[PDB]
């Protein structure tokens, strides 16, 4: 009834008590139950707390002092709405979020449920309606709301409380909704990495014999490999560099200390799923990112990982990797040879009728066989490395470039064997694709990688500017040009390919009098000359000059994510013939279990000095017994 | 390097002037300019009537401003226009 909510929203505290005289006369139950309003599930209980002001409504306490008389109290706590928009926010959701801490302290001392489940559409992820996720379950409200102190209270709660296990219909636990949550910014990385520890240290405390962190969501994904896909990179800064010193939170503690002499110390970073975890490590989670994953090519100048691929790198990945390029030199020399050298006379196929036609034919061979080699591999690269269709023609530039090398180099043997000419149309753009892919192999070098990082930025965003623009104006004047000849210059090919000579300065002014208007012609050449070589030349120029001072750390960031990608496919590629990724980490004791056992984490040395933290608060240090590892 | 920032402020520019002149154009083909917003009530007059008001939303968030001080917040008896 309306008359019934509208002394609830004016808290109108003597209506209230004169329609308790009212109900209580009555048997309540479907009475109340159809009173609420239609399609919304809007009892008095839900409707109180929105419409309440400074902390109070003076009709919550009342509306549960009636609840308590009358029965079926638990009902109207439980009584979450009915739409699919609104689904499943209880009454203690919207306790916890309008700030009121004694509020919600009634509501689960009065049988109000706290595993809670609202998914309904406001609670999930669509841009249309921006709705706010939160995690789906209120012990996850507060932590992204900042409220401590009441998610200190929903685990100390009496009779019932939270399960600080969180998995709702997404799956997504508490740790999981904080990563969801984060935005990379300042206020919410520094709110976000505090509350891991607190729920931490609480999961630690309260529910010990779980580590919250390894538990995952219906995608199968940690906060950890949900931060590493997400984007979250101060998040996870925290969840790598996590460095708790306490006694009975301390295995959780990722960054330990394995020494301090003096300023020196060796920290004892952890690689628990950076690199070898049954799924989703952070490495492959970054690296193997499909576009658009926001900040993307920063996520590996988090320690240890900046660290942890150069050790990859100079001890495993640097000596597989100059091997790979220097079998694909000659892979390019045995092909260029090959085709260099080939048959002019003739239709193929040919014969192997000179002793040098048996080399040949082998340089063939030994050609084909690195086609369907970079074919396949760049097959499996779509069938490893699932991409979309945004990924396939971006982020993806090389996978791409070595398979369209195989296209035309397969199709060479097709027209080859389909006897005709046009195989060297083919076999001459694997070649120029085939030696314009040995830049790929720049990754390995930091200086010439980064070079060819500056390569691929300008020709996606300088080349393609400029380049559009400027076959507007070459088709644009070359059309007026051949318009104007009569008649030899008379075609567009002839005219294109003439005033392109202005861009590589070798354009005539006069190469047709086959005109009819000199000044007609004079001007739009100039016109041509101006707009092309002396503006838009010179312009690209300097917006090259403007790129490479904006992509200067930004292109060292895409060099080591291209070396990462090249470290992690090293290891997938060559999980048998030495060894495993061989791990890239010694198994070391940190301390111990809080069941009272030993740890031994696969960790990463990093030797730190320090020339200010003179005191060196002990904490952590583990082989203080010892003093660097003797 | 000077017109870095100054050169997407003419941008902007140029297709406001093309998103007017779009809207002068089709002024009878398809419809009016689609007045692009929702007519919405906002509160209540100081004469004591509704609102009405022409208006156009924007999703914000804020990680700092925690105390929520509610103040205007209108469809507060809803909670996100359901
Ligand atoms: C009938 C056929 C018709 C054609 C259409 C069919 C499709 C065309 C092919 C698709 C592709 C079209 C490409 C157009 C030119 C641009 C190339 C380019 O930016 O590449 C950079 C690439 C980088 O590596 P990666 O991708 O691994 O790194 C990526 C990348 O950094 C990303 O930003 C990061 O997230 C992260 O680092 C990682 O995700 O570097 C190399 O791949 C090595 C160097 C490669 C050479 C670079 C120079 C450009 C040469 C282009 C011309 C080829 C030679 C002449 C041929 C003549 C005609 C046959
Ligand atoms: C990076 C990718 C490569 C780019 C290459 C760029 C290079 C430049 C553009 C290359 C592509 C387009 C070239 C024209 C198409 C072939 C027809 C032609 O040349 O002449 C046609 C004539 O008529 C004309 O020349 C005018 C008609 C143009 C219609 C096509 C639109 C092209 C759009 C894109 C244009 C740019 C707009 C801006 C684009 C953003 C007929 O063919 P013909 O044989 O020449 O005529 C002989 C006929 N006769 C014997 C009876 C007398
Ligand atoms: C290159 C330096 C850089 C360093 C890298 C070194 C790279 C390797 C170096 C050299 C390898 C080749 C040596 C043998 C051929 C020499 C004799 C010969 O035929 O000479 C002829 C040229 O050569 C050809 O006509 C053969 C075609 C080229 C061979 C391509 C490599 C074959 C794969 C196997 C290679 C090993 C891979 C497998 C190993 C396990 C002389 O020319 P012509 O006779 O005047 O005219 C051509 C003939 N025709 C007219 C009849 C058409
Ligand atoms: C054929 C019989 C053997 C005789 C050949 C004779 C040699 C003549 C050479 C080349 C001709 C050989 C065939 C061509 C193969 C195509 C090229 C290729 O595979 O490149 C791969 C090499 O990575 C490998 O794993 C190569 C496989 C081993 C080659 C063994 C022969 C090398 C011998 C000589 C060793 C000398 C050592 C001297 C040390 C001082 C490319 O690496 P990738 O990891 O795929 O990364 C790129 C792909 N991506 C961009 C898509 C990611
Ligand atoms: C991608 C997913 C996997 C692909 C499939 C997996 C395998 C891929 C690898 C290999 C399989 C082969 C694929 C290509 C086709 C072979 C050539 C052919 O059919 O030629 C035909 C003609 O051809 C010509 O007339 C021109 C030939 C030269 C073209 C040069 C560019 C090569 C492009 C390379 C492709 C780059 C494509 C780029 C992709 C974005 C021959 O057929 P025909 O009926 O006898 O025609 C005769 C006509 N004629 C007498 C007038 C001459
Ligand atoms: C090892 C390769 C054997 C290849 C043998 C074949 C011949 C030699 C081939 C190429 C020359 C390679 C020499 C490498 C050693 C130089 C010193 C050095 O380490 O780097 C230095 C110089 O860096 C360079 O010289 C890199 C140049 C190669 C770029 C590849 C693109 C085109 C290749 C086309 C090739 C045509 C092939 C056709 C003819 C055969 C720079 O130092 P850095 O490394 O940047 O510093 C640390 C980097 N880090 C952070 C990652 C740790
Ligand atoms: C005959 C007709 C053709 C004539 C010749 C054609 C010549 C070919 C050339 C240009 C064609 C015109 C497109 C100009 C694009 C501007 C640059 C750009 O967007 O670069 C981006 C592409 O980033 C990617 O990831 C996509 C890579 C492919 C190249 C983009 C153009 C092709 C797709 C579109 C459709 C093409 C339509 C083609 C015609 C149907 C990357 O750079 P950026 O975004 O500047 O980076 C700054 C970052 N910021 C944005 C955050 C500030
Ligand atoms: C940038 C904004 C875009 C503007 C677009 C529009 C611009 C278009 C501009 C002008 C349009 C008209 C020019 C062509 C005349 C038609 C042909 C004609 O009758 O020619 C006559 C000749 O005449 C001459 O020889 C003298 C030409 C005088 C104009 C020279 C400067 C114009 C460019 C100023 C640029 C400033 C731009 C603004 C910046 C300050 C007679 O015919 P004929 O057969 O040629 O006679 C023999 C000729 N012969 C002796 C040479 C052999
Ligand atoms: C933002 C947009 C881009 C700009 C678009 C607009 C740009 C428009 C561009 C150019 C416009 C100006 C040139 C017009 C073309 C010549 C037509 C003509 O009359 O030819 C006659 C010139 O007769 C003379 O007396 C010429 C004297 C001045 C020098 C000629 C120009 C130099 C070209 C370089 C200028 C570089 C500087 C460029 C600055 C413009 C030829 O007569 P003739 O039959 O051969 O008789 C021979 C003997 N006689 C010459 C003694 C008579
Ligand atoms: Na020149
Ligand atoms: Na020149």
Redesign the pocket.
Same mark, same amino acid.
């Given at each position: 009834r309306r008359s019934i909510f509208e002394a609830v929203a004016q808290n109108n505290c003597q209506d209230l008590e004169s329609l308790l005289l009212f109900l209580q006369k009555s048997k309540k139950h479907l009475t109340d139950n159809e009173f609420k309003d239609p399609e919304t599930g809007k009892t008095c209980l839900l409707k109180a707390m929105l419409n309440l002001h400074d902390g109070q409504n003076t009709t919550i306490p009342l509306l549960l002092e009636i609840a308590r008389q009358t029965d079926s109290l638990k009902e109207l706590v439980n009584a979450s709405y009915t739409d699919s928009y609104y689904k499943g926010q209880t009454a203690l959701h919207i306790a916890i979020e309008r700030r009121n801490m004694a509020l919600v302290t009634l509501l689960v001392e009065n049988g109000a449920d706290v595993q809670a489940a609202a998914h309904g559409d406001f609670f999930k992820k669509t841009k249309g309606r921006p709705g706010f996720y939160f995690g789906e379950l209120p012990l996850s409200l507060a932590a992204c709301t900042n409220q401590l102190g009441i998610v200190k209270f929903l685990l100390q709660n009496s009779w019932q409380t939270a399960d600080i296990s969180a998995r709702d219909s997404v799956g997504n636990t508490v740790l999981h909704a904080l990563v969801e949550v984060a935005d990379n910014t300042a206020d919410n990385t520094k709110f976000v990495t505090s509350m891991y520890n607190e729920i931490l240290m609480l999961g630690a405390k309260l529910h010990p014999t779980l580590k919250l962190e390894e538990l995952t969501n219906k995608k199968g994904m940690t906060p950890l490999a949900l931060a590493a896909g997400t984007g979250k990179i101060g998040v996870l800064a925290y969840i790598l560099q996590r460095e708790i010193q306490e006694p009975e939170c301390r295995h959780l503690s990722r960054k330990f200390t394995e020494w301090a002499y003096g300023p020196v110390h060796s920290s004892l970073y952890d690689l628990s799923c950076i690199d070898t975890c049954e799924k989703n490590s952070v490495l492959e989670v970054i690296a193997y990112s499909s576009s658009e994953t926001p900040n993307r090519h920063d996520m590996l100048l988090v320690e240890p990982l900046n660290r942890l691929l150069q050790d990859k790198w100079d001890r495993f990945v640097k000596r597989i990797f100059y091997f790979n390029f220097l079998v694909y030199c000659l892979y390019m020399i045995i092909f260029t040879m090959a085709a260099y050298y080939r048959p002019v006379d003739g239709l193929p196929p040919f014969k192997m009728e000179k002793t040098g036609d048996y080399f040949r034919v082998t340089g063939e061979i030994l050609s084909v066989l690195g086609g369907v080699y970079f074919f396949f591999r760049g097959i499996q690269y779509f069938l490893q490395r699932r991409p979309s269709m945004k990924t396939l023609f971006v982020d993806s530039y090389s996978e791409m470039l070595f398979f369209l090398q195989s296209l035309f180099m397969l199709a060479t043997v097709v027209l080859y064997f389909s006897h005709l000419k046009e195989y060297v149309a083919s076999m001459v753009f694997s070649l120029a694709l085939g030696w314009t892919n040995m830049l790929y192999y720049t990754r390995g070098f930091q200086q010439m990688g980064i070079y060819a990082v500056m390569i691929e930025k300008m020709i996606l965003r300088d080349l393609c500017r400029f380049m559009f623009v400027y076959i507007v104006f070459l088709f644009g004047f070359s059309t007026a040009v051949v318009t104007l000849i009569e008649d030899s210059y008379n075609s567009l090919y002839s005219t294109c390919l003439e005033l392109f000579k202005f861009t590589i300065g070798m354009g005539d002014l006069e190469f047709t009098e086959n005109y009819?208007?000199? $000044?007609?012609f =004079? =001007?739009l050449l100039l $016109?041509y000359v101006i707009l092309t070589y002396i503006l838009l030349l010179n312009m690209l120029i300097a917006l090259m000059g403007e790129t490479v001072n904006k992509i200067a750390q930004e292109s060292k960031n895409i060099w080591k994510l291209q070396r990462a990608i090249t470290i992690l496919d090293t290891e997938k590629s060559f999980l048998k013939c030495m060894r495993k990724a061989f791990r890239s980490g010694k198994l070391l004791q940190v301390g111990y279990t809080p069941d009272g056992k030993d740890d031994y984490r696969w960790c990463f040395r990093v030797d730190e000095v320090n020339w200010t933290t003179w005191n060196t608060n002990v904490g952590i240090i583990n082989e203080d017994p010892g003093n660097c590892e003797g």
């Open positions: 009819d208007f000199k $000044a007609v =004079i =001007i $016109a």
